[PDB]
Write an enzyme that holds these catalytic residues in place. Sequence first.
Site, PDB file in Angstrom:
ATOM      1  N   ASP A  46      33.806 -11.901   3.280  1.00  0.00           N
ATOM      2  CA  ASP A  46      35.214 -11.430   3.242  1.00  0.00           C
ATOM      3  C   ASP A  46      35.840 -12.197   1.484  1.00  0.00           C
ATOM      4  O   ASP A  46      35.290 -12.698   1.205  1.00  0.00           O
ATOM      5  CB  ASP A  46      35.915 -12.198   4.147  1.00  0.00           C
ATOM      6  CG  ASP A  46      37.392 -12.321   3.864  1.00  0.00           C
ATOM      7  OD1 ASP A  46      37.975 -10.909   3.853  1.00  0.00           O
ATOM      8  OD2 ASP A  46      38.395 -13.001   3.905  1.00  0.00           O
ATOM      9  N   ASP A  68      38.844 -11.528  -0.662  1.00  0.00           N
ATOM     10  CA  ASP A  68      40.077 -12.268  -1.743  1.00  0.00           C
ATOM     11  C   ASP A  68      40.872 -12.632  -2.440  1.00  0.00           C
ATOM     12  O   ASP A  68      40.938 -12.866  -3.472  1.00  0.00           O
ATOM     13  CB  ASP A  68      41.128 -13.258  -0.381  1.00  0.00           C
ATOM     14  CG  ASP A  68      40.389 -13.269   0.982  1.00  0.00           C
ATOM     15  OD1 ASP A  68      39.414 -12.727   1.403  1.00  0.00           O
ATOM     16  OD2 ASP A  68      40.743 -14.225   1.460  1.00  0.00           O
ATOM     17  N   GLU A 112      43.628 -12.189  -5.163  1.00  0.00           N
ATOM     18  CA  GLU A 112      44.560 -11.580  -5.377  1.00  0.00           C
ATOM     19  C   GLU A 112      44.735 -11.947  -6.277  1.00  0.00           C
ATOM     20  O   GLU A 112      44.843 -12.844  -7.438  1.00  0.00           O
ATOM     21  CB  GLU A 112      45.638 -13.362  -4.677  1.00  0.00           C
ATOM     22  CG  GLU A 112      45.013 -13.159  -2.997  1.00  0.00           C
ATOM     23  CD  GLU A 112      45.113 -14.238  -2.383  1.00  0.00           C
ATOM     24  OE1 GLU A 112      46.482 -14.484  -2.179  1.00  0.00           O
ATOM     25  OE2 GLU A 112      44.319 -14.525  -0.593  1.00  0.00           O
ATOM     26  N   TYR A 136      52.585 -11.406   5.210  1.00  0.00           N
ATOM     27  CA  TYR A 136      53.398 -12.394   5.508  1.00  0.00           C
ATOM     28  C   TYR A 136      53.636 -12.977   3.680  1.00  0.00           C
ATOM     29  O   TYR A 136      53.603 -12.040   3.029  1.00  0.00           O
ATOM     30  CB  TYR A 136      52.530 -13.723   6.606  1.00  0.00           C
ATOM     31  CG  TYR A 136      51.178 -13.726   6.028  1.00  0.00           C
ATOM     32  CD1 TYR A 136      50.721 -14.839   4.738  1.00  0.00           C
ATOM     33  CD2 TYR A 136      50.187 -13.401   7.418  1.00  0.00           C
ATOM     34  CE1 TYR A 136      49.728 -14.175   4.516  1.00  0.00           C
ATOM     35  CE2 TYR A 136      48.907 -13.735   6.823  1.00  0.00           C
ATOM     36  CZ  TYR A 136      48.513 -14.064   5.567  1.00  0.00           C
ATOM     37  OH  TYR A 136      47.241 -14.353   4.692  1.00  0.00           O
TER      38      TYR A 136
HETATM   39  N1  LIG Z   1      56.321 -13.775  -5.158  1.00  0.00           N
HETATM   40  C1  LIG Z   1      54.815 -14.512  -5.443  1.00  0.00           C
HETATM   41  C2  LIG Z   1      54.381 -15.521  -4.439  1.00  0.00           C
HETATM   42  O1  LIG Z   1      53.858 -14.142  -3.741  1.00  0.00           O
HETATM   43  C3  LIG Z   1      53.459 -16.163  -5.092  1.00  0.00           C
HETATM   44  O2  LIG Z   1      53.157 -17.773  -3.548  1.00  0.00           O
HETATM   45  C4  LIG Z   1      51.985 -17.012  -3.298  1.00  0.00           C
HETATM   46  O3  LIG Z   1      52.269 -16.029  -2.482  1.00  0.00           O
HETATM   47  C5  LIG Z   1      50.447 -15.511  -1.407  1.00  0.00           C
HETATM   48  C6  LIG Z   1      50.653 -14.924  -0.539  1.00  0.00           C
HETATM   49  O4  LIG Z   1      49.190 -14.845  -0.436  1.00  0.00           O
HETATM   50  C7  LIG Z   1      50.661 -17.211  -1.372  1.00  0.00           C
HETATM   51  O5  LIG Z   1      48.783 -17.609  -1.249  1.00  0.00           O
HETATM   52  C8  LIG Z   1      48.257 -17.042   1.076  1.00  0.00           C
HETATM   53  O6  LIG Z   1      48.624 -18.441   1.349  1.00  0.00           O
HETATM   54  C9  LIG Z   1      47.996 -19.573   1.528  1.00  0.00           C
HETATM   55  C10 LIG Z   1      48.543 -20.763   0.956  1.00  0.00           C
HETATM   56  O7  LIG Z   1      49.844 -20.700   1.239  1.00  0.00           O
HETATM   57  C11 LIG Z   1      46.735 -19.337  -0.103  1.00  0.00           C
HETATM   58  O8  LIG Z   1      45.706 -19.917  -0.356  1.00  0.00           O
HETATM   59  C12 LIG Z   1      45.206 -21.060  -0.957  1.00  0.00           C
HETATM   60  O9  LIG Z   1      44.152 -20.962  -1.804  1.00  0.00           O
HETATM   61  C13 LIG Z   1      43.888 -21.909  -2.539  1.00  0.00           C
HETATM   62  C14 LIG Z   1      42.090 -22.091  -2.024  1.00  0.00           C
HETATM   63  O10 LIG Z   1      41.726 -23.332  -2.783  1.00  0.00           O
HETATM   64  C15 LIG Z   1      44.316 -23.455  -1.742  1.00  0.00           C
HETATM   65  O11 LIG Z   1      43.651 -24.529  -2.210  1.00  0.00           O
HETATM   66  C16 LIG Z   1      43.466 -25.326  -1.399  1.00  0.00           C
HETATM   67  O12 LIG Z   1      45.322 -26.165  -1.622  1.00  0.00           O
HETATM   68  C17 LIG Z   1      45.923 -27.553  -0.857  1.00  0.00           C
HETATM   69  C18 LIG Z   1      46.774 -27.452  -1.061  1.00  0.00           C
HETATM   70  O13 LIG Z   1      47.806 -27.453   0.412  1.00  0.00           O
HETATM   71  C19 LIG Z   1      44.550 -28.824  -2.083  1.00  0.00           C
HETATM   72  O14 LIG Z   1      44.722 -29.639  -0.828  1.00  0.00           O
HETATM   73  C20 LIG Z   1      43.916 -30.822  -1.348  1.00  0.00           C
HETATM   74  O15 LIG Z   1      42.941 -31.347  -1.277  1.00  0.00           O
HETATM   75  C21 LIG Z   1      41.890 -31.994  -1.616  1.00  0.00           C
HETATM   76  C22 LIG Z   1      40.477 -31.863  -0.997  1.00  0.00           C
HETATM   77  O16 LIG Z   1      40.142 -30.679  -0.728  1.00  0.00           O
HETATM   78  C23 LIG Z   1      42.781 -33.136  -1.767  1.00  0.00           C
HETATM   79  O17 LIG Z   1      41.992 -34.191  -1.924  1.00  0.00           O
HETATM   80  C24 LIG Z   1      41.397 -34.682  -0.941  1.00  0.00           C
HETATM   81  O18 LIG Z   1      42.478 -35.502  -0.256  1.00  0.00           O
HETATM   82  C25 LIG Z   1      42.168 -36.339   1.211  1.00  0.00           C
HETATM   83  C26 LIG Z   1      42.903 -37.484   1.727  1.00  0.00           C
HETATM   84  O19 LIG Z   1      42.557 -37.616   2.699  1.00  0.00           O
HETATM   85  C27 LIG Z   1      40.276 -37.274   0.559  1.00  0.00           C
HETATM   86  O20 LIG Z   1      39.872 -38.026   1.434  1.00  0.00           O
HETATM   87  C28 LIG Z   1      39.803 -36.513  -0.023  1.00  0.00           C
HETATM   88  O21 LIG Z   1      38.223 -37.580  -0.871  1.00  0.00           O
HETATM   89  C29 LIG Z   1      40.440 -35.676  -1.347  1.00  0.00           C
HETATM   90  N2  LIG Z   1      38.679 -34.542  -1.227  1.00  0.00           N
HETATM   91  C30 LIG Z   1      44.117 -33.045  -2.738  1.00  0.00           C
HETATM   92  O22 LIG Z   1      44.470 -34.634  -2.706  1.00  0.00           O
HETATM   93  C31 LIG Z   1      45.015 -32.006  -1.897  1.00  0.00           C
HETATM   94  N3  LIG Z   1      46.604 -31.500  -3.033  1.00  0.00           N
HETATM   95  C32 LIG Z   1      42.942 -27.769  -1.482  1.00  0.00           C
HETATM   96  O23 LIG Z   1      41.664 -28.777  -2.259  1.00  0.00           O
HETATM   97  C33 LIG Z   1      42.964 -26.484  -2.120  1.00  0.00           C
HETATM   98  N4  LIG Z   1      41.792 -25.958  -2.069  1.00  0.00           N
HETATM   99  C34 LIG Z   1      45.251 -22.871  -2.085  1.00  0.00           C
HETATM  100  O24 LIG Z   1      46.428 -23.880  -1.483  1.00  0.00           O
HETATM  101  C35 LIG Z   1      46.385 -21.862  -1.755  1.00  0.00           C
HETATM  102  N5  LIG Z   1      47.601 -21.065  -2.741  1.00  0.00           N
HETATM  103  C36 LIG Z   1      46.229 -17.839   0.161  1.00  0.00           C
HETATM  104  O25 LIG Z   1      45.003 -17.639  -0.562  1.00  0.00           O
HETATM  105  C37 LIG Z   1      47.065 -16.305   0.811  1.00  0.00           C
HETATM  106  N6  LIG Z   1      46.892 -16.136   2.540  1.00  0.00           N
HETATM  107  C38 LIG Z   1      50.237 -18.370  -2.178  1.00  0.00           C
HETATM  108  O26 LIG Z   1      50.042 -19.438  -1.889  1.00  0.00           O
HETATM  109  C39 LIG Z   1      51.682 -18.272  -2.788  1.00  0.00           C
HETATM  110  N7  LIG Z   1      51.997 -19.939  -3.603  1.00  0.00           N
HETATM  111  C40 LIG Z   1      54.707 -17.862  -6.088  1.00  0.00           C
HETATM  112  C41 LIG Z   1      53.980 -18.906  -6.370  1.00  0.00           C
HETATM  113  O27 LIG Z   1      55.228 -19.779  -5.726  1.00  0.00           O
HETATM  114  O28 LIG Z   1      54.667 -16.555  -7.040  1.00  0.00           O
HETATM  115  C42 LIG Z   1      55.427 -15.862  -6.715  1.00  0.00           C
HETATM  116  O29 LIG Z   1      55.971 -15.369  -7.822  1.00  0.00           O
END
Ligand SMILES: N[C@@H]1[C@@H](O)[C@H](O[C@@H]2O[C@H](CO)[C@@H](O[C@@H]3O[C@H](CO)[C@@H](O[C@@H]4O[C@H](CO)[C@@H](O[C@@H]5O[C@H](CO)[C@@H](O[C@@H]6O[C@H](CO)[C@@H](O[C@@H]7O[C@H](CO)[C@@H](O)[C@H](O)[C@H]7N)[C@H](O)[C@H]6N)[C@H](O)[C@H]5N)[C@H](O)[C@H]4N)[C@H](O)[C@H]3N)[C@H](O)[C@H]2N)[C@@H](CO)O[C@H]1O
Length: 538
Positions: free
Chosen positions: A289, A291, A293, A368
């Site tokens: 897949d 993706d 963006e 969405y």
């Molecule tokens: N008009 C625009 C707007 O469109 C725009 O808004 C955007 O619109 C798009 C529309 O497509 C949205 O994208 C869609 O939805 C999702 C999210 O809603 C998209 O997914 C994105 O992909 C990435 C992949 O990497 C995501 O990354 C991940 O995000 C999370 C946060 O929730 C991270 O969490 C962290 O995880 C780590 C570990 O992995 C944590 O650390 C851990 O903590 C634990 C605790 O137990 C510990 O045990 C561990 O040891 C430790 N590792 C850490 O604390 C967390 N913070 C992930 O790691 C991270 N990989 C990303 O979230 C996501 N955005 C998808 O592509 C799509 N379908 C947009 O999201 C949206 N922004 C706006 C912008 O605001 O602007 C306008 O102009």
Amino acid sequence: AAAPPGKPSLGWGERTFAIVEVNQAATAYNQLVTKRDSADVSVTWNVWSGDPADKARVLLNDKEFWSGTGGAAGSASFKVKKGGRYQMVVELCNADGCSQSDATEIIVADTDGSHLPPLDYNMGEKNKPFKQTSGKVVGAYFVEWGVYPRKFPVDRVPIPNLTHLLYGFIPICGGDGINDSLKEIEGSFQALQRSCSGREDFKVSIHDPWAALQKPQKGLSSWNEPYKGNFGQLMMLKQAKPDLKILPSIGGWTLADPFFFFTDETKRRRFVASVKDFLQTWKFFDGVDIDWEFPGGKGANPNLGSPKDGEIYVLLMKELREMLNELSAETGRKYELTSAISAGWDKIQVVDYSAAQKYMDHIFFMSYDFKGAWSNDTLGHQASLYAPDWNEKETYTTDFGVQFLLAQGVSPKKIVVGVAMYGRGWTGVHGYKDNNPFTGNATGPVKGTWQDGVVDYREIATEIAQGKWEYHYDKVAQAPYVFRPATGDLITYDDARSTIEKGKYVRANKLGGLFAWEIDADNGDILNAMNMGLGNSA
Ligand SMILES: N[C@@H]1[C@@H](O)[C@H](O[C@@H]2O[C@H](CO)[C@@H](O[C@@H]3O[C@H](CO)[C@@H](O[C@@H]4O[C@H](CO)[C@@H](O[C@@H]5O[C@H](CO)[C@@H](O[C@@H]6O[C@H](CO)[C@@H](O[C@@H]7O[C@H](CO)[C@@H](O)[C@H](O)[C@H]7N)[C@H](O)[C@H]6N)[C@H](O)[C@H]5N)[C@H](O)[C@H]4N)[C@H](O)[C@H]3N)[C@H](O)[C@H]2N)[C@@H](CO)O[C@H]1O
Ligand SMILES: *[C@@H]1O[C@H](CO)[C@@H](O[C@@H]2O[C@H](CO)[C@@H](O)[C@H](O)[C@H]2NC(C)=O)[C@H](O)[C@H]1NC(C)=O
Ligand SMILES: *[C@@H]1O[C@H](CO)[C@@H](O)[C@H](O)[C@H]1NC(C)=O
């Protein structure tokens, strides 16, 4: 008259082996995984006072794998190319007859799950079991980070109810400039660099090896299960449903940045080769897949994007398919090439999807995130089918995007419509006319489940039931929303009613089916709706 040799007694040694070795203690991907094309088995045996010149054979499940003399106190080493649980026996032969050792079981592990029992499930929460009868696509995304605070490992995935499972996300190796978007999220860019250490950029990696391959989950806690974590369970998953399609999703919002450098044909080729290597290494996957963006920009990075991306998007699809074609040649399997694309017409316009679709199985139409807390004065429906009555010339709706996409000459069967298992919302929504909270303005994001401005449907569903919300349904737009006139809280989401309506739309227009982001935020209602709305059997 018969007097065969003495019964061989198998010595002690290794009983578990792996065609793909995984270092349970590695942070870097290059140190984490070595794909071999065969495993390497060794067996020791012993017969006190035997004839060393007798004939000896090693039999894995009554089939020969080695052949020699052994006789008394012998030894053999041979190569096994297909994983599974084997009964191992050493056979001795002389002029009279043969002797067989007692069987000892060995594990030859491999990433298509051969060595593993089927991941089994129980319907959880509101899920009801369905049969994929409709021939429609029913997909859902599973996030890697789901196994931490969210507490959603693979075994909670209601796998009778899906045809496709998309794994989000698989990153592309890159440092400063390449993958800057990761920096808005703390720890993540750094986490990537540790993973890709010693790895050529623009190859694919694993963002979190712990989550993916090393974390103990149900059925894989034993200290040498070759594969644990997410990938381990996904292997057991294809073993319960061999027909369920599991795709690695590359990119997403914060990982899409490397795609903009594929104007460089050298970098693109390295990528495609790395995906080929990735699939040969992780055999439970069924293709790719993409993706990105978004082609042309307007994603996370405001400095990246070009009109020249539309043409690159298509060449990436051409080269990926060609890679899968020769991957099929060597493995005899079928592979799927899919991609998640924007539902905004102004991003769709960048690419010629009629040009790319001949390489693709499906298009996951991200219908969405049409509206969100990223704006205080553009309130609306996040994932509605049509435009609302109070704003008929709304271009950001499911219907508008699909029609716009078809108008390029895309065949309706390949379009898979997106459904939201989450809410986007606002607080302090004031100054609205006609008892319609969308005509006003917000003072910020709603309070979120994990993140601000975003709420799990499970959270929304539960609180509607505790009377904490005013539920309404825009019958013209076909979308629900909750409102709290006190605090001024407003939330857009998909519920089972809008989801059934998307189902009816998909069927009326002969579309591919529905998919959902993201599988863990559902309580079962929505996936039930997706299935019940696409004509599947309960
Ligand atoms: N008009 C625009 C707007 O469109 C725009 O808004 C955007 O619109 C798009 C529309 O497509 C949205 O994208 C869609 O939805 C999702 C999210 O809603 C998209 O997914 C994105 O992909 C990435 C992949 O990497 C995501 O990354 C991940 O995000 C999370 C946060 O929730 C991270 O969490 C962290 O995880 C780590 C570990 O992995 C944590 O650390 C851990 O903590 C634990 C605790 O137990 C510990 O045990 C561990 O040891 C430790 N590792 C850490 O604390 C967390 N913070 C992930 O790691 C991270 N990989 C990303 O979230 C996501 N955005 C998808 O592509 C799509 N379908 C947009 O999201 C949206 N922004 C706006 C912008 O605001 O602007 C306008 O102009
Ligand atoms: C939505 O409105 C809020 C409040 O009007 C904005 O947040 C304010 O931003 C200014 C900028 O310096 C700060 O002085 C304030 O402290 C912020 N909030 C409050 C409550 O005082 C917010 O930026 C707006 N959001 C968008 C996307 O426009
Ligand atoms: C909402 O914000 C817009 C932004 O320009 C403004 O023009 C409008 O008057 C505001 N509406 C109310 C009711 O405050």
